[PDB]
Amino acid sequence: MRLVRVNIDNKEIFAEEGKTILEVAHENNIEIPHLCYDKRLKPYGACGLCVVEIEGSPKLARACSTYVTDKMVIKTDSPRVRNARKMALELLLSEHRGDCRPPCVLACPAHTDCQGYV
Amino acid sequence: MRLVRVNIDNKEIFAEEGKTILEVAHENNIEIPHLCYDKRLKPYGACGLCVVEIEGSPKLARACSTYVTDKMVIKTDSPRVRNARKMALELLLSEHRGDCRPPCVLACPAHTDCQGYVGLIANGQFREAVALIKEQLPFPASIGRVCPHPCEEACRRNMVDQPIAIAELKRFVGDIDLLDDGYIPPIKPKTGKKVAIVGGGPAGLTCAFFLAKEGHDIVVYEAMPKAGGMLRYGIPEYRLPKGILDKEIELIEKMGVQIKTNMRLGVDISLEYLRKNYDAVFLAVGAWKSSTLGCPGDSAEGVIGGIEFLRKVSMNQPVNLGQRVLVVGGGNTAMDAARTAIRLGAKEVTVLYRRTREEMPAEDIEVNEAEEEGVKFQFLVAPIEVITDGGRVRALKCQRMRLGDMDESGRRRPVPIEGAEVIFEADTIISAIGQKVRVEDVEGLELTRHGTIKVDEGTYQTSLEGVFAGGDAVTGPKIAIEAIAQGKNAARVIDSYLRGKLEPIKEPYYVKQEDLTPEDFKDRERKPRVPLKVANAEERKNNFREITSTMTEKEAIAEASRCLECGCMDYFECQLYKYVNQYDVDPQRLSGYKHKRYEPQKHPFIERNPDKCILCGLCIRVCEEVVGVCALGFVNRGFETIVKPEFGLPLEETSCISCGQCADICPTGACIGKQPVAKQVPVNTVATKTVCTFCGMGCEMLVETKGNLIFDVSPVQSNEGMLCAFGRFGIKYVNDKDRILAPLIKVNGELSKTTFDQALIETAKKLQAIRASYGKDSIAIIASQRLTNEEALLLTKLAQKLDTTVIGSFDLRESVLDRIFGLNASTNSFDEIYSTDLIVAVGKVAENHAVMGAKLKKAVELGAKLVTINNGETRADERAIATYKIDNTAFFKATIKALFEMKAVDEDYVSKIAVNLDELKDDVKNVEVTDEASEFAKIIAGAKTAMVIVDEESVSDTTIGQLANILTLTQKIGRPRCGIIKVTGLGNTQGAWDMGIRMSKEGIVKLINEGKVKAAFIVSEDPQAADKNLGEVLDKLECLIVADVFLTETGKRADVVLPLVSHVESTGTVTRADGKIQNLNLVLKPKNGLSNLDLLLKLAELFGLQYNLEKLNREMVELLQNENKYNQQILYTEGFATPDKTVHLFVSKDAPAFVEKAVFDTVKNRFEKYLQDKHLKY
Amino acid sequence: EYRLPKGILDKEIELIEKMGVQIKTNMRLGVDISLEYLRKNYDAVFLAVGAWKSSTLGCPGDSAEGVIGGIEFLRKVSMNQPVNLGQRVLVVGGGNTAMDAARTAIRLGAKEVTVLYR
Ligand SMILES: Cc1cc2nc3c(=O)[nH]c(=O)nc-3n(C[C@H](O)[C@H](O)[C@H](O)COP(=O)(O)OP(=O)(O)OC[C@H]3O[C@@H](n4cnc5c(N)ncnc54)[C@H](O)[C@@H]3O)c2cc1C
Ligand code: SF4
Ligand code: SF4
Ligand code: SF4
Ligand code: SF4
Ligand code: SF4
Ligand code: SF4
Ligand code: FES
Ligand code: FES
Secondary structure, three states: OOEEEEEEOOEEEEEEOOOEHHHHHHHOOOOOOOOOOOOOOOOOOOOOOOEEEEOOOOOOEEOOOOEOOOOEEEEOOOHHHHHHHHHHHHHHHHOOOOOOOOHHHHHOOOOOOHHHHO | OOEEEEEEOOEEEEEEOOOEHHHHHHHOOOOOOOOOOOOOOOOOOOOOOOEEEEOOOOOOEEOOOOEOOOOEEEEOOOHHHHHHHHHHHHHHHHOOOOOOOOHHHHHOOOOOOHHHHHHHHHOOOHHHHHHHHOOOOOOHHHHHHOOOOHHHHOOHHHHOOOOOOHHHHHHHHHHHHHHOOOOOOOOOOOOOOEEEEEOOOHHHHHHHHHHHOOOOEEEEEOOOOOOOOHHHHOOOOOOOOHHHHHHHHHHHHOOOOEEEOOOOEOOOEOHHHHHHHOOEEEEOOOOOEEOOOOOOOOOOEOEEEHHHHHHHHHOOOOOOOOOEEEEEOOOHHHHHHHHHHHHOOOOEEEEEEOOOHHHOOOOHHHHHHHHHHOOEEEEOEEEEEEEEOOOEEEEEEEEEEEEEEOOOOOOOEEEEEEEEEEEEEOOEEEEOOOEEOOOOOOOOOOEOOOOOEOOOOOOOEOOOOOEEEOOHHHHOOOOHHHHHHHHHHHHHHHHHHHOOOOOOOOOOOOOOOOOOOHHHHOOOOOOOOOOOOEOOHHHHOOOOOOOEOOOOHHHHHHHHOOOOOOOOOOOOOOHHHHHHHHOOOOOOOOOOOOOOOOOOOOOOOEEEOHHHOOOOOHHHHHHHHHHOOOOEEEEOOHHHOEEEEHHHOOHHHOOOOOOOHHHHHOOOOOEEEOOOOOOOOOOOOEEEEEEOOOOOOOOEEEEEEOOOOEEEEEEOOOOOOOOOHHHHHHHHHHHOOOEOOOOEEEEOOEEEEOOHHHHHHHHHHHHHHHHHHHOOOOEEEEEOOOOOHHHHHHHHHHHHHOOOOOEEOOOOOOOOHHHHOOOOOOOOOOHHHHHOOEEEEEOOHHHHOHHHHHHHHHHHHHOOEEEEEEOOOOHHHHHOOEEEEOOEOHHHHHHHHHHHHOOOOOHHHHHHHEEOHHHHHHHOOOOOOOHHHHHHHHHHHOOOOEEEEEEOOOOOHHHHHHHHHHHHHOOOOOEOOEEEEEEOOOOOHHHHHHHOOOEOHHHHHHHHHOOOOOEEEEEOEOHHHHOOOHHHHHHHOOEEEEEEOEOOOOHHHOOEEEEOOOHHHOOEEEEOOOOOEEEEOOOOOOOOOOOHHHHHHHHHHOOOOOOOHHHHHHHHHHHHHHOOOOOOOOOOOOOOOOOOOOEEOOOOOOOEOOOOOOOOEHHHHHHHHHHHHOOOOO | OOOOOHHHHHHHHHHHHOOOOOOOOOOOEOOOEOHHHHHHHOOOOOOOOOOOOOOOOOOOOOOOOOOOOHHHHHHHHHOOOOOOOOOEEEEEOOOHHHHHHHHHHHHOOOOEEEEEOO
């Protein structure tokens, strides 16, 4: 078929027209964070973790809803993108209540999974 | 994406919009025939084989050009489609002239690849010849000793002088194999099935062989003390020694076949037990009951059957042979009995035959040998009575007869003559008029009218279910190769039955040439056949020693070289043969006028046969669309259409660059690439992927080998799927007979062969003596840039241990990119070429690297803009928007000045990223801006992205510096699709530079001429051949150590010569011109047992260095990481490699833009000289 | 090497190793291993260290650059290590070491080798 040419993280990729940046990067083993995406569902654009830097666009684009076009240059780990993802994650952690690990595991110097084996 | 839904052959498929039916079916493993299709080319629609039935379309649609739409229903094997494909194939076969298989193979009952193993013998591949014989015949030596060889009667060399000694060559290779451990084919994993063969003769042992090849558990039941059948008990020792038979039966037993001798069916074991405890039963009991004289008195004391007598003699059991022996019959049994009786001391042996001499069933050579040994013959007589005196034979009353009229035979029936009767005195009569299947062997089975087992043809199954039969038990007495053919076919059918899918044997369709007559071979040189050594009759008639001798290796090769190679060279890859065998074609109905336009050609690499052309156009389309040379075309029109080079000229005289793409794309052997071997032979090869080492493009290839010889090279299907003349045809040096395999050291002033240890010790001592007597940096290590990264790194470590920094290459170009950007490397990758806005190709980019020319053609077709800068014409000028013919660097300087005049240089950014900007402005301020320079500057400034492709083997370093300046000024470096790519002149130029081999020819020669360097260790370079002025420079050296694949002119003046192996015998890593690292995989084991890395590692262990391939690879990866050049498709994305991380702009005086230099690599220089001698281009 | 090739020596040492003897090379006594450890963990200890220290010239200036012991020089040549051997070599002595050093210096490219004996 007709193939678009993209540059994701300094790697030249020949993708197929009609895919999103998330799908193209998944195919080429490039990790882009995402929390509200699902291949069975229409895009939602809520979490804001999949933002990538596209050369020529002043605003970061959601990789889950942006489609790859011909002669595209994409950065997925630039300092702007990392800062945006860190800010989104901090906002998410602000409204979070939980124990990732129980206090018993954290009090063990060797971090033995006390809860797990109990 | 959006997916279309299709139904191809009742299977629902979710495909992608924009694909054709061919691609969708290929992805879903659905086979649609195609002959004129290629993924790199636009559709052509000529062959009409890919037609499919689409529901809703009354007309069949070509799958190669029809696109899949939503809710489509496609049939690819409906009767309409099959009929259309069969008709197209029959039409294609109507034009075809060729031999799919040679007449020798078709005349063999077992269809042994006579041509294949004869050609392998002519190439010295005796083990491969035996392995190829054993695909159809498990007993080469035995059968080659005793075979009437109809293949030689059908041989086409009969039309020239004398047929090939096919049987003798088979005997030769069989004996060679039996010298050492014999060849055993690979055995499939155990299948859990059990087959019982009754009878260890040729047919039973063949069935056991070919069923043990399939993994089944085989038990053979033999009534005799030993296996072998009539090969042991019928054929006498002087014609087939039993040691060879024993060795071959041991070979069969070594495959897991268990032979239970002295186990007769119906006495020791029953058929019903075999049916109960075995999955299949094969019966190969032969015809072991002899025919009686059929006259009164044929039961006296002194009458014996021919095969019973021969079996008694074979077992060394006593025989009451008198002094007057009458052998009745005219077959092989009669001749063997008569000659054995002669050798057993009988004073008179007479052979009585019913018919005439000129129609004897026996071979003429056997009858002639019997006549020489003293056997007498009587013809046209038949026995009517046996005169017995006291119960013992006294004489035989025979009826004289005459050839009366026709018969069921059809030739002539012998009938009695009345009144004529003759009495022959005889102490013994041997009845040898034929053998019949024993009734007791075939108990419980339905037989024919001759007593043989009745089987269904094609399946070999008897009346009983699960019980098969073959051989002399089924067909009656024949020759042994017929029994072997029956056993092999029965093994195939039995394997199918064990899989539960009983299939009869299907005869393939072969294209043949029945119109050939001797005048078609009148131009061939006549060569005598190998003479057959025959023991003297007088001495041989007294003993049971072998009569004939095996030929010698010289005679074997000379005899195999006589073959005319009648079979098609494309048989194992022809798509037309495969398709006409997939569809039941009857091409004799559409048979008429057929062209015969084939003419022999002198081209060393490509052979074209118009008579095998299906006019798919693929060769033309690939030369025009992919290569871009466009050397082929259509000539004439209609039925007269032919494919010809330009103006019908020979391929050498056209613009052809000998890339071989036409021969690689051809479906039906009308365009083939010649094998780099001594004699052409169509063989089934094994392909290994490796990397071409002849330039920096790093094209991958599949080397197809058979044994220790390379037979073909195929490009991989990656990008343009192209190789050039080098990568496709220069691998011929691997098979060269002039390769040195043992080291040479100078004794008595001349180079003589020695051992590796002695040569390496001599090398180490010579280098150490030079270092001692002359000090530091007195030894130069000049290495070829085709070595792997590990070998280059090890050579740098060897220079470190030898206390010398003078390590470089004579092919090494002066470096300027490390002074400007920091690393002497390409900035971007090859893939980005397809996506850049503008391409600037400098130098002979397409000429020196044809695949890069194809890549530029593809990139311009994809939407790029091409600018070519060169001093002469190039093939890339066709699609260039701007073509500049310059001879001086000033053209770039003016360009730079022009770039400043149009305010196209953002000096604010350049001042932060680059230094020497004011010096650059001062340097270019006084130059004159030309119209060409201003137009180039306009093109450069108007492009968003730009990549400069530079041919570093035809471009000076000043040009590269100025192009780097232009790229830096316009901010076209360190970004995707913007940069500079240097296509290096050899395979691992970049890797050699990275590993520390960074000295040029000029520096090394300057050191030698100043007396500072006194010894040279030269690794696979040819300074003496590639240059005439260096012969004086090499005169200043006191010690010369040369490592090379060939003994060259520079190696003939060396003190020590160390052999090197080819790159297909080496494993390692090579760095592409764009910086990518690829793996050199091992295709062939090294021919002297030592790889290049192994030899260098022995020389290193002589110096106290401990390394291996893995340690050197780890060091290489560390080195690349330390330079920030590891796994980086784009360089200087963060900053440049200069100490201040800034661009050091190139300021220098004007210099010539392009250079012409020789190739110092030995192999590439040799191949270039070979191409020049044959007047070829590349 | 021209008087005793080292392949023969290697073969004979391999023969000795094939008899159950284990050879721990690069294990110097007093540096890598101690005598007391040998006494502790072995029933018997045999010392066959040889005489591996050469005799100096015993004259003023015998520590300059260009003076080397005979066996040190021969060990350097045997190990294929660089030796700063000029063009005028003076071998002092008259024993086995003197003759071997003189002939090795001849084979190493020295244009003048002289042997001085008391
Ligand atoms: C005298 C003579 C000379 C020949 N010369 C030539 C020649 O020069 N060139 C040539 O090409 N061919 C020659 N042939 C032909 C060739 O030898 C036979 O065609 C070939 O051996 C056929 O093999 P087969 O397996 O069909 O039968 P055979 O090998 O005859 O029989 C196979 C085995 O079955 C065994 N057997 C029989 N009955 C039983 C039973 N009840 N239970 C168990 N095992 C049993 C037998 O012992 C024998 O070992 C010759 C044959 C003869 C007799
Ligand atoms: S080109 Fe193909 S079909 Fe024609 S003779 Fe050769 S193998 Fe047979
Ligand atoms: S010349 Fe060679 S290929 Fe042709 S029939 Fe004879 S053996 Fe076969
Ligand atoms: S087995 Fe006989 S017929 Fe077959 S190739 Fe060999 S010699 Fe020819
Ligand atoms: S070898 Fe290459 S250039 Fe020559 S005709 Fe064939 S495809 Fe064209
Ligand atoms: S020679 Fe060319 S046109 Fe003819 S079959 Fe081969 S590829 Fe097709
Ligand atoms: S272009 Fe270079 S790498 Fe490719 S096949 Fe030709 S010589 Fe080999
Ligand atoms: S995955 Fe959540 S915004 Fe894209
Ligand atoms: S017509 Fe489609 S492959 Fe030939």
